[PDB]
Amino acid sequence: NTQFTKAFHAMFPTLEIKIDACYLSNPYASELVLDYIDRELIQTNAYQRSLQKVMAESLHVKPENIFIGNGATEIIQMLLQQEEVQKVALMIPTFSSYYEFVGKGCEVVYFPLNERDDYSFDADKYCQFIENEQPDTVVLINPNNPNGAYLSLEKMHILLKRLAFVPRIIIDESFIHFAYEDEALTCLSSTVLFDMYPNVIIVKSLSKDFGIAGVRLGYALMDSRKIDALLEHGFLWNINGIGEYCLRLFVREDFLKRYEEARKQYIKEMCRFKEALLGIENVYVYPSMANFVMLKLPSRIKASFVISALLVEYGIYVRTMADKIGVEGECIRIAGRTREENNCIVMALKSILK
Amino acid sequence: ASVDTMNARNTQFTKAFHALKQNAGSHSPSMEDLKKMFPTLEIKIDACYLSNPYASELVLDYIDRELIQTNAYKKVLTHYPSQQRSLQKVMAESLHVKPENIFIGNGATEIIQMLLQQEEVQKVALMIPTFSSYYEFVGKGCEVVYFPLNERDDYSFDADKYCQFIENEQPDTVVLINPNNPNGAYLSLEKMHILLKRLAFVPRIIIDESFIHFAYEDEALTCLSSTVLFDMYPNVIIVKSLSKDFGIAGVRLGYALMDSRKIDALLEHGFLWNINGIGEYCLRLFVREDFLKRYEEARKQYIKEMCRFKEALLGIENVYVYPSMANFVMLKLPSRIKASFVISALLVEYGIYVRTMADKIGVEGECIRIAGRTREENNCIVMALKSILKDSK
């Protein structure tokens, strides 16, 4: 496929994409949301500060602590752009480019996650790094993107206690619905960390777990005076009516009872997909509690080779890790799809890599 | 019994109505705020927000037929929407401009606020009156200077004096709204060329043509466009709402034509912006040939109605109607009549909401801005006004 692979790095309408495994979702959550949308909006032809109150009861917080925006990354961009932000500490690898969000002459320092330990890290060493670097802002993505690994609440408590000196600790829990700390798959939430630690800000997407990629939605928990000052500097949101319908749906108890089953079903499919991927000879799949996995390709195989073979031979699109500093080797990120689609990806890769 | 006593009828309502939160947008007070304060108040005609109801019905009909009845709405809500570069390419076809010269965002005013926040912007010339405040969006070092439109000339933009003002002040950035946004007056392409030739020295001349689809220079109602100005004058930036003409309240879209280098730089910072599914559908609709044929019929129909509405308003003895080529008209009420009196009577007695000009600096006397609606709705407005403004008893 040499020619295709060169051009690709440089425009093929012969090319049909049949499975897009780049973007993140939950298809059981999508179907569920769309069921509600059809009943409540389509079959009846129905189709800004006050949005703070929507979620407050379900979250068990004051409406004053709730910031609504277009997405998790957009909110973190807002935070990191502020003048007070002059030195930030991040992990590598991360998927988003937080370095682009900070101001001129803001320094960013990076602590590497350990590929050899499945991109976990030594908690004591990381905290020593923050103690020695003295950043004013820390960003943690938990579960992390792109490898998907999750730090337990117990472990996060230890970290956050020790780093109580940092003015801001931002935790993006966008993927936390796919994580679990018990066999029963009780839904996890980082809201407890917002409550217990004055420096903590929580950010969370409402699109990657609820399966509404065409609607832009997210929230954060923050100090209420911080929210006021952001609103004075012009950052008031306004979500359309679709966004609004969805925000209200997602906190409704009757919806949530049904969503809980869609969520746990997807965790189980993520675990089945992973084991099936692990059955491919000569690949490894890093541990994940997200709606994606990161696969390390065999000796001498380039991601670009595998990506092009996937597109040309099977119409499957996956995401290269080559542009993500701190991912060792040649890797791909594969988004979870439906059962049928997941099987097709496993079958394609087995074939390609044999 | 006296006419003056009869005119204090709604005082209790008026006072409570004023107690409510004001804002700088189209509904002040907000519609959500009136429902809680006056829960029995039924709004039958909202003439505050700017739309073309004939285009809006057209677009909803395409949505119904193409998204709702087919179930294609499912994918619009569920799939990741296209990124900026792909949206540039959609607009390039129908705009006849290089894709990399197109910036797609939420609205004209949001785009102008992004422009004015840049650090090169250190002195800006604005006109007064204007509906949107732009002074809150400039950097703290930045100076703002105001060119005053004069009420005695119907707020007509005197182009020679403006140019001399710009030569004297040497702003690096100017904002022109054409047609202008609560009075509606429009400067011809002929006169815009003269102005822009003379102001070639200015770094950035931002022209908001969000209402230009409502103006006309010939009886055939040939659609006007400021793209000619973008193509000819290297200091021009064109900005345009796609929401106030293609008419689609809950989907917020606008574009700008500007230096491609500058767009490239903004897009390296960067994905601060994503369109939503429904936004994208509408954007791709708005440039289809077959849609545009029907849209053009709706645009011309709406201009014909606006002309009829303005003529009908001119028939009301004690108001002055300011000349307009937009989708709204500004009215000066007789002396001794407050806008608040008129606004309250319209709400209470007729369910009609119109926008006060009391909070817009530079607007003399007591004025209201009324958005042009359908023929039936316009008739109701004219009727309601005539009755409310009858000297009477």
Side-chain angles (χ1 to χ4, degrees):
Chain A
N1 288 131
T2 293
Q3 192 175 331
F4 178 92
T5 302
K6 285 213 174 53
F8 178 67
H9 198 278
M11 54 161 42
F12 337 80
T14 164
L15 183 72
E16 194 207 358
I17 312 186
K18 304 170 184 178
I19 300 176
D20 178 353
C22 283
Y23 85 93
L24 306 177
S25 193
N26 175 348
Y28 309 144
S30 287
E31 185 182 0
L32 185 69
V33 170
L34 290 172
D35 170 35
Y36 279 88
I37 289 178
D38 174 49
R39 283 144 79 270
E40 301 187 342
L41 299 191
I42 283 52
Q43 290 305 102
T44 24
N45 216 63
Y47 69 83
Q48 297 173 340
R49 257 169 222 94
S50 173
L51 297 165
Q52 285 182 326
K53 307 219 303 110
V54 173
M55 274 185 96
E57 190 151 298
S58 187
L59 296 171
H60 308 110
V61 307
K62 277 180 177 100
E64 294 90 343
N65 293 127
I66 299 178
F67 190 96
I68 307 283
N70 305 322
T73 304
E74 290 85 346
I75 291 160
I76 293 169
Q77 174 178 45
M78 176 189 323
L79 295 172
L80 293 180
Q81 275 177 355
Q82 302 307 308
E83 291 194 59
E84 320 132 307
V85 187
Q86 288 292 279
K87 192 167 186 191
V88 176
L90 313 177
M91 307 290 206
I92 228 77
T94 243
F95 191 93
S96 302
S97 282
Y98 301 96
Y99 80 96
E100 286 187 67
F101 305 156
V102 304
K104 196 188 192 278
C106 180
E107 184 192 1
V108 189
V109 298
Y110 300 83
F111 187 89
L113 293 165
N114 184 352
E115 188 277 338
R116 288 221 170 82
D117 190 25
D118 273 344
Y119 295 101
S120 183
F121 60 106
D122 186 325
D124 172 44
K125 297 283 148 17
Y126 169 70
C127 290
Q128 291 177 41
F129 175 79
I130 302 297
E131 288 157 354
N132 306 155
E133 292 294 341
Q134 291 301 122
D136 60 75
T137 302
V138 159
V139 178
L140 298 165
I141 320 292
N142 187 47
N144 195 44
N145 184 3
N147 57 293
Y150 172 71
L151 203 68
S152 69
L153 288 152
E154 194 151 293
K155 285 179 249 117
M156 282 286 338
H157 276 300
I158 295 159
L159 246 51
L160 288 172
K161 281 176 157 53
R162 181 163 169 182
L163 303 178
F165 65 88
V166 177
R168 284 171 231 87
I169 301 183
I170 298 166
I171 311 173
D172 178 355
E173 64 158 4
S174 289
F175 302 110
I176 203 173
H177 275 22
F178 304 110
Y180 54 93
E181 292 182 12
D182 56 6
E183 278 168 12
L185 310 180
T186 307
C187 195
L188 300 162
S189 168
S190 308
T191 299
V192 62
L193 312 173
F194 175 67
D195 286 339
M196 288 183 43
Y197 303 96
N199 64 2
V200 164
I201 294 168
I202 304 299
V203 186
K204 198 179 161 281
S205 171
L206 301 164
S207 47
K208 281 150 177 57
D209 47 2
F210 294 105
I212 50 157
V215 180
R216 290 158 68 229
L217 216 50
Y219 84 89
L221 302 178
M222 314 188 185
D223 166 89
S224 54
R225 278 171 325 312
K226 214 316 172 48
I227 293 172
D228 290 327
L230 294 175
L231 301 181
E232 291 167 58
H233 298 149
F235 287 106
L236 180 60
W237 45 84
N238 50 348
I239 77 171
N240 64 21
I242 302 310
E244 197 187 333
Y245 171 89
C246 288
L247 191 68
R248 292 173 184 285
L249 179 61
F250 297 162
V251 289
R252 247 168 49 197
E253 183 276 346
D254 61 305
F255 173 83
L256 287 176
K257 294 303 298 209
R258 305 248 295 257
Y259 174 71
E260 271 294 294
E261 302 296 306
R263 186 186 64 77
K264 291 187 212 153
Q265 188 180 204
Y266 210 59
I267 292 171
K268 286 171 192 80
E269 170 62 15
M270 281 311 305
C271 293
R272 186 195 72 87
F273 183 38
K274 258 188 274 134
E275 300 305 279
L277 287 175
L278 278 176
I280 298 184
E281 286 183 45
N282 299 316
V283 311
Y284 182 60
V285 184
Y286 295 95
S288 184
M289 268 177 191
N291 62 337
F292 49 86
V293 300
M294 194 178 79
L295 191 148
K296 188 187 222 340
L297 293 170
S299 198
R300 309 192 162 171
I301 307 289
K302 291 284 174 151
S304 64
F305 160 83
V306 173
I307 289 167
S308 297
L310 281 168
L311 283 166
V312 175
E313 291 165 33
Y314 303 89
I316 298 162
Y317 197 17
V318 301
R319 185 66 164 78
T320 190
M321 293 290 86
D323 60 333
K324 306 302 184 186
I325 297 314
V327 173
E328 290 190 23
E330 286 293 318
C331 292
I332 55 182
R333 198 190 67 182
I334 309 180
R337 283 291 160 262
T338 67
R339 271 171 206 107
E340 174 178 61
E341 291 173 327
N342 293 346
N343 291 330
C344 182
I345 290 159
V346 167
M347 169 288 293
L349 281 161
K350 276 177 186 282
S351 167
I352 285 160
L353 291 180
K354 185 187 162 59
Chain B
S2 83
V3 177
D4 308 53
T5 302
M6 290 176 158
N7 290 346
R9 258 173 290 122
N10 296 138
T11 295
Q12 187 178 6
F13 178 93
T14 305
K15 284 193 196 209
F17 172 89
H18 288 345
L20 292 165
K21 299 322 197 103
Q22 283 194 33
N23 61 266
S26 282
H27 303 89
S28 190
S30 86
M31 215 80 134
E32 299 95 331
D33 275 1
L34 280 180
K35 174 61 189 278
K36 61 183 77 212
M37 185 65 105
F38 306 108
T40 58
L41 179 60
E42 93 177 338
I43 310 298
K44 294 160 136 172
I45 298 169
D46 178 355
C48 286
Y49 74 102
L50 313 175
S51 198
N52 170 353
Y54 305 103
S56 172
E57 301 200 351
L58 184 69
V59 181
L60 289 165
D61 182 65
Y62 277 89
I63 294 175
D64 185 22
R65 292 156 30 243
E66 301 187 346
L67 294 185
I68 300 303
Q69 291 190 318
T70 64
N71 293 144
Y73 83 90
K74 290 187 178 175
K75 303 308 202 76
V76 170
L77 295 178
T78 258
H79 285 175
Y80 267 73
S82 306
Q83 313 318 117
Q84 181 86 20
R85 297 297 177 191
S86 143
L87 298 172
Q88 285 188 335
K89 284 153 188 132
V90 175
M91 296 295 280
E93 168 187 85
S94 60
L95 272 46
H96 304 124
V97 180
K98 171 171 168 54
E100 302 62 33
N101 286 118
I102 309 173
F103 179 92
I104 316 281
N106 290 315
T109 306
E110 302 68 17
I111 292 165
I112 294 172
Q113 293 167 166
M114 170 194 84
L115 294 173
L116 292 184
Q117 282 172 325
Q118 307 297 104
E119 68 185 351
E120 322 84 67
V121 183
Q122 292 299 138
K123 185 167 190 185
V124 60
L126 309 177
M127 295 172 295
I128 180 181
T130 326
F131 194 87
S132 308
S133 247
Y134 304 97
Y135 80 96
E136 318 98 307
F137 297 94
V138 306
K140 65 183 222 181
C142 182
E143 300 183 23
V144 185
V145 290
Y146 287 94
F147 184 80
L149 277 352
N150 161 59
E151 191 276 341
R152 321 163 316 90
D153 319 323
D154 281 336
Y155 296 106
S156 187
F157 185 79
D158 176 337
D160 180 80
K161 288 171 190 182
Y162 179 75
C163 284
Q164 186 58 247
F165 174 73
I166 299 306
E167 283 163 352
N168 294 353
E169 290 288 333
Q170 296 291 313
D172 57 78
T173 306
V174 155
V175 184
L176 302 175
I177 315 297
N178 194 45
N180 204 31
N181 47 33
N183 61 294
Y186 171 72
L187 193 65
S188 62
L189 273 169
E190 172 165 312
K191 305 259 261 278
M192 278 307 317
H193 277 294
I194 296 160
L195 177 156
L196 294 172
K197 289 176 147 48
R198 177 160 179 190
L199 300 184
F201 64 89
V202 178
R204 286 165 289 279
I205 299 179
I206 293 160
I207 306 174
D208 182 0
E209 62 162 10
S210 288
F211 307 107
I212 201 168
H213 272 25
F214 311 111
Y216 58 90
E217 287 185 28
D218 61 353
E219 279 286 278
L221 311 178
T222 310
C223 190
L224 296 164
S225 176
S226 309
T227 302
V228 287
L229 312 176
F230 179 67
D231 290 343
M232 184 170 304
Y233 300 103
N235 64 344
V236 167
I237 293 161
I238 302 299
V239 181
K240 181 160 186 299
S241 170
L242 296 168
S243 304
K244 299 163 193 206
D245 56 4
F246 298 98
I248 288 165
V251 357
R252 296 210 321 155
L253 293 169
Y255 73 93
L257 307 181
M258 63 181 103
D259 178 76
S260 60
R261 234 57 50 102
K262 181 183 170 92
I263 292 168
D264 290 325
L266 295 174
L267 303 179
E268 169 136 335
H269 231 295
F271 201 59
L272 161 40
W273 159 254
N274 174 33
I275 199 167
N276 48 19
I278 187 58
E280 182 174 356
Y281 169 80
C282 283
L283 199 86
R284 293 179 180 277
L285 185 69
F286 293 166
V287 307
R288 256 147 64 186
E289 174 270 308
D290 52 308
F291 172 81
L292 278 163
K293 180 171 291 78
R294 297 189 202 171
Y295 168 69
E296 191 58 12
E297 296 165 2
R299 186 185 66 79
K300 294 196 260 245
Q301 174 181 31
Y302 189 69
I303 292 170
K304 290 176 196 165
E305 179 48 38
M306 275 301 321
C307 289
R308 192 208 138 262
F309 186 44
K310 290 179 277 178
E311 190 182 58
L313 288 166
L314 278 173
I316 301 176
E317 178 186 35
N318 323 301
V319 292
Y320 184 81
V321 191
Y322 291 94
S324 183
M325 293 258 267
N327 63 333
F328 53 80
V329 190
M330 201 175 233
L331 263 62
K332 177 144 150 270
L333 303 171
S335 219
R336 313 201 345 115
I337 302 298
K338 290 296 176 166
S340 58
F341 170 74
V342 179
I343 295 158
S344 296
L346 286 160
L347 281 170
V348 166
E349 293 162 24
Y350 305 88
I352 295 173
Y353 203 10
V354 307
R355 181 53 168 79
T356 189
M357 296 278 93
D359 62 343
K360 294 310 175 176
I361 300 315
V363 182
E364 294 197 10
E366 287 290 319
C367 291
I368 54 170
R369 196 196 63 184
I370 312 177
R373 305 320 297 160
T374 62
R375 190 190 298 119
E376 246 153 290
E377 290 182 319
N378 292 341
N379 191 57
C380 290
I381 294 169
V382 174
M383 274 176 160
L385 288 167
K386 267 194 192 130
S387 152
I388 294 165
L389 301 177
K390 208 184 179 176
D391 239 11
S392 196
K393 178 190 175 67

